[PDB]
Design an enzyme around this catalytic site. Structure first.
Site, short mmCIF file in Angstrom:
data_model
loop_
_atom_site.label_atom_id
_atom_site.label_comp_id
_atom_site.label_asym_id
_atom_site.label_seq_id
_atom_site.Cartn_x
_atom_site.Cartn_y
_atom_site.Cartn_z
N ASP A 49 44.52 33.53 38.89
CA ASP A 49 43.19 34.15 39.78
C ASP A 49 42.52 35.32 38.65
O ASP A 49 43.57 36.51 37.90
CB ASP A 49 43.97 34.35 40.72
CG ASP A 49 44.78 35.41 40.90
OD1 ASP A 49 45.50 35.16 40.25
OD2 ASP A 49 45.21 36.49 41.81
C1 8Q1 Z 1 48.93 56.78 42.21
C2 8Q1 Z 1 47.68 56.61 42.20
C3 8Q1 Z 1 47.41 55.71 44.05
C4 8Q1 Z 1 47.30 54.68 43.66
C5 8Q1 Z 1 47.07 53.88 45.31
C6 8Q1 Z 1 46.52 53.28 46.02
C7 8Q1 Z 1 47.11 52.20 47.30
C8 8Q1 Z 1 46.48 50.15 47.71
C9 8Q1 Z 1 47.33 49.62 48.62
C10 8Q1 Z 1 47.01 48.23 48.38
C11 8Q1 Z 1 45.39 48.29 48.68
C12 8Q1 Z 1 45.30 46.58 49.56
O1 8Q1 Z 1 45.91 46.01 49.72
S1 8Q1 Z 1 43.77 46.15 49.94
C13 8Q1 Z 1 43.56 44.85 51.00
C14 8Q1 Z 1 42.39 44.18 51.03
N1 8Q1 Z 1 42.32 42.60 51.33
C15 8Q1 Z 1 41.29 41.32 50.82
O2 8Q1 Z 1 40.17 41.31 49.94
C16 8Q1 Z 1 41.38 39.87 51.52
C17 8Q1 Z 1 40.80 38.75 51.01
N2 8Q1 Z 1 40.50 38.56 49.55
C18 8Q1 Z 1 40.11 38.11 48.59
O3 8Q1 Z 1 38.83 39.04 49.00
C19 8Q1 Z 1 40.04 38.53 46.72
O4 8Q1 Z 1 40.65 36.86 47.32
C20 8Q1 Z 1 40.74 39.37 45.94
C21 8Q1 Z 1 42.37 39.99 46.45
C22 8Q1 Z 1 39.87 40.44 46.25
C23 8Q1 Z 1 41.31 38.86 44.84
O5 8Q1 Z 1 40.66 37.47 44.30
P1 8Q1 Z 1 40.79 36.58 42.80
O6 8Q1 Z 1 42.29 35.92 43.07
O7 8Q1 Z 1 39.84 35.29 43.05
O8 8Q1 Z 1 40.25 37.76 41.24
#
Ligand code: 8Q1
Ligand code: CDL
Ligand code: PLX
Ligand code: PEE
Lengths: 88, 98, 124, 459, 67, 80, 128, 110, 178
Positions: free
Chosen positions: A43
């Site tokens: 993916d």
């Molecule tokens: C130390 C530095 C700082 C770090 C802090 C950062 C914090 C991050 C925490 C986590 C962020 C989230 O959960 S962000 C939550 C966002 N939710 C979604 O995106 C649900 C729907 N999924 C999709 O649209 C696709 O499946 C996709 C997932 C794009 C993949 O696609 P491929 O498989 O087709 O590539």
């Protein structure tokens, strides 16, 4: 002097090296022409980890817009070659 | 996801052209067609310049007052002057706290 | 540090001030005081061109060390006795200054103790 | 003084009777020869000026100015013959005639014994300059620039004429020697205040004083290259020379009549230097820099000390050389790309290395690097001003910083970075341009070895 | 001295760089030990620091508070 | 000249901190598919590295030996 | 949850912290497409002259010319004497001059009346 | 200070050139063995910077700290000087620990 | 750098870019390889937790609060590749890049050296001159009436055609030109 000019052949050997060091890819069934999502069943996040491994490999960063489309090892070879000015 | 057909085809064509250009930036075996003593450094870079400077200081610069001034040399008790042959007496029989 | 703690937090009246010292006469508590002497003449320290802060009561040992360093020039490690002598004279000068400090401190404490307690014996 | 003057006049028919393809060669050769002959006025007696005759005399103030004029003429000819190639023979001869008449008027003005003759020649310089600007100027804006240059100048100089004839009626003479030996104090009255103003404002507007400076960006930017060269190198110095001469009859009034002009010159020094930091035009930047430098000269003349007069002389000469060099450097690029905008052509050091060296040296003398004579003049003026009041160092110090800033800004913007991709008509530097830059620069560097020559009468 | 890259392995070392590095490190340590054997005073101090409370008032010249 | 890559079959995370990472991630129901890419940073000549104090004391053995030799020679020389 | 970042003039707001790029409507997408089209038409017009073999010289840019004209020649035609313009002009124009006059006049009066008193330490001050 | 600070910069430069013009210490791994002479030199320079006894740094810096301790001086200045003397040891330690100890963190083409 | 940009980024592209940025800054915080590998797997897991969300609104709010977290917890000094737009070698060799049109202003004595290079350059110039008009015509053919819509260019489609607007892409100076 510094490093010898890169040769497409060394490039492609190196990309294949990192690709068989990836746990989600079958080594005995990976080819230079294997599609990442389509043939190997990955993916987008796997593909992102793969570009990041490639920058760790060749010591230069790849822009996100360009990467979105490196979907087979040959495309990565072509990108690195055309970026670092290697013809053979 | 990935390139479109036209994108990939154009990248391939541009790639072939660019590689031909880079190949043709190479030089042929003849390209730069150009048209048609052991102690020599220490004598022209150290010896000659010190001859000119010492000549310049000895006969020109020191031909005028107050151009080269040296702080007067230290004198100690028990020293002997070179000009007058003076002797400066020594210094008062230390309490000798040995 | 302890003297700074005593002066800045304790009663600063009971501590000598380094700028204005001594405030007591040099003959106050002593019956007789021999005044410090000099071994090097002004002319000697002028002909040696020591420095105006090196012209203290230890300057004769400095003239020793300087003449001996100039005499044994290539062997820059031969002037050890002279260096030790000058260092020792400087150390004794420094302990004299420390005795002056300590002497001043006790007198101030003693004077305050006697003066305000004769005020005590006068208040009743 | 006749020996210098007649040959200069001769230059006129020599160029009018020359073959069509030899005008530049002839004019350049004989201009250089005249410059060499003039070089002999630098021998000065000491106690007094050399009085050749009743009409002309040379000073240690005067000698440096004359040599700079005569030396500037051949450089103007070298700079002109490129953009004048398409011109007809008659119009090229007319252009050269304008330059020669300007040189002739300038030499006479500096050496005239009395003020009325000085005034007449100092005003006669207006006609050839105006003709050069308005006839050979590249842009439409040149006509407006010509009007600004004329009117600002005449509005100052006519009260000077009235004041001069009044002074000769009351004193009996305008000869500078008699004026000096029979000097008497100026009382503090309204009549004397207005006489002071009428004696000073013409030279103030020539410098230019801040706030009366608006003609200079127009005229210096809209002029052809030789016009700009002579406007910055020599014509600004008429004000300084005239003020240094005239302030002998103005004491002791100057003690307090100088206050507003000192305030204007110091604050406007800061102002014009800051303006140079946000300028989109490259000639506009060099013009405002000239303004900032002349503000320093105005301060030096107003405080009336020997060190300030020495510094003013040195700064006038050094500015004349440096400003002409900077204008020529800008004109080479303009000739390449046909635009004055500073960010149009970038990274020129990659394409033209020796011209980048010339740029660096001109920028280093503009910010007065020691031991150049630019810094000699600036340092002497700053010391005199410190004696005048210790608070001037703050203004002087601030000005030094802003000058370094905009000088290196210009250098970095035009020479460094990457070249504009689209412009592909930047040809190698011609021998003519390199020789023009060297002939500006070598004399300045040579002057450092013998500082006293440009120091002046006070020395 | 021709050394070629190695790709994920410890680089090729010559004997000269090792001998020179070890020689100079050992030189530094020998120098420090030699100096501390001969000039230990420069680090540990040489002259004793006096204690002011060890000081009698007879040598220090103050009277016993009745005069 | 013209070297090529060692076999990728050798880079194995056992005996390395990558093994500990793998087990601590298995204790969470996760897994790391990139450890064999890092295994070379621990496998070969980079197996064992010194500590800080052991690094500061680099040439101390030879230096101390030479120092003792010299001061013993001093012990034995001023006896003339 | 986490401490918030507030933007200012000299440290602007990051794009990922901008609430506007996370509240998308169809009109926003049409605006973005229009902008891209404008950028594209300009890019093609530039690249057609840039790659031209027969083109020698400097491609002229009307945006640069508009910028320099607006910064120099268009300013006075668009000026009005306003309370703001007049007050700012008076302040930034004559304020500093009178400030510096007061400072220098005060300093020099002090120094001169100090000289009249015979009190300044002027020894060795031959050069001026 | 001229001697050992110039040497420290030259050591950093040899490191940077060996690691393909990389200057971030987070991508410099175990060089204590890979660059033995550079390591020796940078360790000796770090010991001179920190005032190790009978070294060039020691005569100049230890005397300075001794004189700052025993003079009629601003107390805050003295305290800040001592804290800075500790800070010097800490930064030197950071460079050595990060650049020369541990495992390699640079790209694989050595 | 090489691809024509689009009018906007999709939710998916934003999410992937945030994934990459979070991973890089985490690597900056976690210097060592094993510890970074551990926390990067924890990151991937926390990222996969919301992988299959169907409500676009809640996915957008997750992305937004994730960006807020990244901004508060980012590294003030992240690692940059040396030739990247913040690197210590970013534009180091731009002073060595000279455009190819400078070679036509060379003196004939300079071109006397290198005869073969300049013959081959004359061949390249002939090629460009004979391709230009076909390139222009093709671009006029394949382009909508209301001007182009993106920055994308078509390839060559005929026998001896070249991709339109190729000269300044093919004849780049180099990235280590000296
Ligand atoms: C130390 C530095 C700082 C770090 C802090 C950062 C914090 C991050 C925490 C986590 C962020 C989230 O959960 S962000 C939550 C966002 N939710 C979604 O995106 C649900 C729907 N999924 C999709 O649209 C696709 O499946 C996709 C997932 C794009 C993949 O696609 P491929 O498989 O087709 O590539
Ligand atoms: C101090 C050193 C002493 C050296 C002794 C010998 C000096 C002889 C030089 C004579 C004067 C130089 C002429 C200037 C124009 C340059 C001509 C040129 O195009 O070069 C082509 C030539 C050919 O090279 P190329 O390969 O074809 O390509 C060239 C490229 O264009 C690009 O190549 P590039 O990148 O190399 O650029 C060329 C070069 C040239 O560009 C320059 O800027 C050189 C000029 C220096 C700055 C000028 C303004 C600053 C004000 C100082 C005024 C001092 C003048 C004193 C009298 C001099 C008489 C002429 O630029 C620089 O190198 C950087 C300049 C920075 C200099 C900063 C120094 C500040 C003051 C130093 C002391 C000054 C007082 C001395 C005494 C003090 C008390 C003891 O290149 C050179 O020859 C290099 C020039 C040598 C550098 C001289 C710098 C210091 C000399 C200053 C004056 C000399 C004083 C002598 C008194 C005794 C002491
Ligand atoms: C933008 C750049 C333009 C160029 C700058 C030109 C600068 C010109 C300014 C002239 C400097 C001062 C002029 C005269 C000196 C003193 C002026 C006066 O105010 O001082 C007092 C004068 O008292 C009163 O102020 C009377 C003058 C007030 C009337 C003048 C109007 C001033 C308003 C400002 C208008 C702006 C003028 C410039 C136009 C552009 C001194 O008191 P007093 O001792 O008794 O008089 C001395 C003369 N005595 C000895 C003959 C008696
Ligand atoms: C480009 C802009 C330049 C503008 C310059 C304008 C200022 C020039 C200086 C003043 C100009 C007029 C001065 C007159 C010439 C001097 C003659 C003189 O000194 O005679 C005076 C006469 O003085 C006058 O009459 C002058 C009065 C002013 C009349 C004209 C006013 C014009 C405006 C004056 C203020 C502007 C001056 C400064 C402005 C600078 C530019 C901004 C004394 O003679 P008596 O009459 O015999 O008196 C004693 C015997 N009873």
């Amino acid at each position: 002097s510094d490093a010898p000019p890169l040769t497409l052949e060394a490039i492609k050997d190196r990309v294949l090296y990192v690709l068989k060091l990836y746990d989600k890819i079958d080594p005995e069934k990976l080819s230079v022409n294997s599609h990442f999502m389509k043939d190997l069943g990955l993916d987008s996040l796997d593909q992102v980890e793969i570009i990041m491994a490639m920058e760790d490999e060749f010591g230069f960063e790849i822009p996100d817009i360009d990467a979105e489309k490196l979907m087979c090892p040959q495309e990565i070879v072509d990108y690195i070659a055309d970026k670092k000015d290697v013809y053979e | 996801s990935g390139y479109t057909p036209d994108e990939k085809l154009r990248l391939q064509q541009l790639r072939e052209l660019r590689r031909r250009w880079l190949k043709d930036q190479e030089l042929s075996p003849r390209e730069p067609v150009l048209p048609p003593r052991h102690s020599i450094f220490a004598v022209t870079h150290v010896l000659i310049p010190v001859w000119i400077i010492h000549y310049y200081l000895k006969y020109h610069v020191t031909a005028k007052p107050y151009t080269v001034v040296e702080r007067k040399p230290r004198i100690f008790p028990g020293d002997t002057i070179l000009e007058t042959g003076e002797v400066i007496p020594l210094m008062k029989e230390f309490p000798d706290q040995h | 540090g302890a003297h700074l703690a005593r002066r800045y937090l304790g009663d600063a009246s009971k501590e000598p001030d380094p700028l204005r010292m001594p405030t007591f006469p040099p003959d106050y508590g002593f019956p007789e005081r021999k005044e410090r002497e000099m071994v090097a003449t002004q002319q000697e320290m002028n002909d040696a061109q020591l420095m105006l802060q090196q012209r203290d009561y230890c300057a004769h040992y400095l003239i020793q060390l300087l003449k001996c360093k100039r005499d044994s020039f290539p062997n820059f490690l031969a002037c050890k006795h002279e260096q030790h002598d000058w260092d020792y004279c400087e150390h004794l000068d420094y302990v004299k200054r420390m005795k002056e400090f300590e002497r001043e401190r006790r007198l101030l404490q003693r004077k305050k103790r006697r003066e305000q307690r004769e005020a005590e014996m006068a208040r009743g | 003084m006749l020996k210098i003057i007649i040959p200069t006049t001769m230059l006129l028919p020599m160029t009018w009777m020359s073959k069509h393809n030899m005008i530049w060669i002839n004019a350049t050769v004989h201009s250089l020869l005249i410059s060499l002959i003039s070089l002999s006025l630098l021998n000065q007696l000491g106690e007094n000026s050399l009085n050749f005759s009743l009409t002309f005399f040379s000073d240690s103030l005067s000698a440096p100015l004359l040599v700079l004029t005569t030396w500037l003429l051949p450089l103007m000819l070298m700079a002109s013959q490129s953009h004048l190639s398409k011109e007809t023979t008659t119009r090229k001869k007319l252009y050269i005639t304008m330059l020669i008449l300007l040189q002739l008027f300038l030499i006479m003005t500096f050496t005239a014994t009395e003020l009325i003759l000085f005034y007449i020649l100092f005003e006669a310089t207006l006609v050839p300059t105006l003709i050069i600007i308005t006839r050979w100027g590249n842009q439409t804006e040149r006509l407006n620039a010509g009007l600004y240059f004329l009117f600002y100048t005449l509005a100052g100089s006519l009260p000077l004429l009235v004041a001069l004839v009044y002074i000769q009626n009351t004193t009996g003479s305008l000869n500078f020697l008699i004026i000096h030996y029979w000097s008497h104090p100026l009382s503090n009255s309204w009549s004397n205040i207005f006489m002071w103003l009428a004696c000073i404002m013409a030279f103030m507007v020539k410098m230019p004083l801040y706030g009366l400076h608006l003609w200079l960006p127009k005229a210096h930017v809209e002029a052809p290259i030789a016009g700009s060269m002579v406007l910055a190198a020599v014509l600004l110095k008429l004000g300084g020379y005239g003020m240094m001469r005239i302030t002998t009859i103005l004491n002791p009034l100057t003690n307090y009549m100088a206050y507003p002009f000192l305030m204007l010159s110091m604050w406007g020094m800061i102002m014009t230097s800051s303006i140079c930091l946000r300028q989109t035009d490259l000639k506009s930047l060099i013009a405002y820099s000239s303004v900032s430098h002349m503000a320093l000269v105005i301060v030096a003349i107003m405080i009336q000390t020997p060190w300030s007069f020495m510094g003013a002389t040195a700064l006038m000469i050094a500015h004349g050389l440096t400003s002409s060099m900077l204008f020529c450097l800008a004109n080479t690029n303009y000739e390449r790309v046909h635009s004055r905008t500073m960010i149009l052509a970038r990274g020129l050091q990659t394409l033209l290395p020796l011209m980048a060296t010339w740029w660096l040296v001109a920028s280093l003398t503009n910010l007065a690097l020691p031991p150049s004579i630019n810094l000699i003049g600036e340092l002497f003026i700053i010391t005199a001003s410190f004696s005048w009041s210790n608070i001037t160092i703050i203004l002087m110090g601030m000005n030094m910083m802003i000058t370094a800033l905009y000088s290196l800004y210009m250098l970095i913007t035009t020479q460094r970075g990457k070249y504009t991709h689209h412009i592909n008509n930047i040809k190698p530097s011609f021998t003519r341009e390199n020789a023009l830059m060297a002939l500006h620069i070598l004399p300045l560097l040579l002057l450092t070895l013998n500082p006293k020559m440009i120091l002046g009468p006070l020395y | 001295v021709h050394i070629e890259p190695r790709y994920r392995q410890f680089p090729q070392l010559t004997r000269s760089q090792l001998i020179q590095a070890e020689f100079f490190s050992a030189t530094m340590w020998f120098w420090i030990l030699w100096r501390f054997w001969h000039d230990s005073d420069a680090v540990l101090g040489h002259f004793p620091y006096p204690d002011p409370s060890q000081w009698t008032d007879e040598e220090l010249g103050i009277l016993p508070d009745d005069e | 000249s013209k070297m090529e890559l060692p076999d990728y079959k050798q880079w194995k995370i056992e005996g390395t901190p990558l093994e500990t990472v793998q087990e601590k991630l298995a204790a969470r129901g996760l897994r790391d598919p990139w450890g064999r890419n890092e295994a070379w940073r621990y496998s070969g000549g980079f197996a064992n590295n010194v500590s800080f104090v052991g690094a500061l004391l680099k040439g101390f053995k030879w230096g101390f030996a030479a120092f003792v030799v010299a001061v013993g020679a001093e012990y034995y020389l001023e006896s003339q | 949850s986490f401490p918030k970042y507030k933007p200012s003039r000299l440290a602007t707001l990051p794009a990922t912290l901008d609430p506007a790029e996370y509240d998308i409507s169809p009109e926003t997408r049409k605006a973005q497409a229009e902008r891209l089209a404008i950028r594209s038409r300009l890019k093609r017009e530039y690249l057609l002259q840039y790659n031209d073999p027969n083109r020698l010289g400097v491609i002229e840019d009307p945006a640069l010319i508009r910028w320099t004209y607006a910064r120099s020649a268009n300013i006075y035609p668009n000026f009005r004497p306003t309370p703001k313009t007049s007050l700012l002009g008076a302040l930034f124009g004559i304020g500093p001059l009178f400030f510096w006059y007061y400072v220098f006049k005060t300093d020099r009066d002090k120094k001169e009346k100090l000289i009249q008193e015979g009190k300044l330490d002027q020894t060795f001050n031959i050069s001026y | 200070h001229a001697f050992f600070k110039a040497m420290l910069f030259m050591c950093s430069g040899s490191i940077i050139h060996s690691l393909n013009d990389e200057q971030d210490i987070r991508k410099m791994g175990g060089l204590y063995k890979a660059m033995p002479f550079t390591t020796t030199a940078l360790i000796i320079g770090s010991l001179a910077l920190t005032g190790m006894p009978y070294l060039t740094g020691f005569y100049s810096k230890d005397l300075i700290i001794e004189a700052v301790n025993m003079s009629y001086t601003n107390a805050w200045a003295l305290l800040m000087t001592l804290i800075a003397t500790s800070l010097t040891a800490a930064y030197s330690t950071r460079i050595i620990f990060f650049a020369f100890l541990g495992k390699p963190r640079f790209p694989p083409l050595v | 750098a090489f691809s024509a940009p689009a009018a906007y980024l999709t939710h998916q592209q934003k999410v992937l870019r945030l994934y990459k940025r979070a991973l890089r800054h985490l690597e900056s915080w976690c210097v060592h390889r094993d510890k970074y590998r551990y926390f990067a797997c924890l990151m991937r897991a926390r990222f996969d937790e919301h992988k299959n969300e169907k409500d676009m609104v809640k996915a957008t709010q997750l992305l937004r609060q994730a960006e807020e977290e990244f901004w508060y917890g980012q590294h003030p000094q992240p690692y940059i590749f040396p030739e990247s737009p913040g690197g210590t070698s970013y534009e180091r060799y731009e002073c060595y890049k000279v455009p190819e049109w400078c070679l036509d202003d060379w003196h004939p004595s300079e071109k006397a050296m290198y005869p073969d290079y300049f013959a081959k350059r004359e061949q390249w110039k002939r090629l460009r001159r004979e391709s230009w008009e076909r390139e222009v015509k093709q671009l006029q053919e394949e382009t909508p009436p209301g001007g182009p819509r993106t920055e994308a260019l078509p390839p060559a489609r005929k026998e001896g055609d070249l991709p339109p607007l190729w000269w300044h892409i093919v004849t780049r100076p180099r990235e280590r030109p000296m």
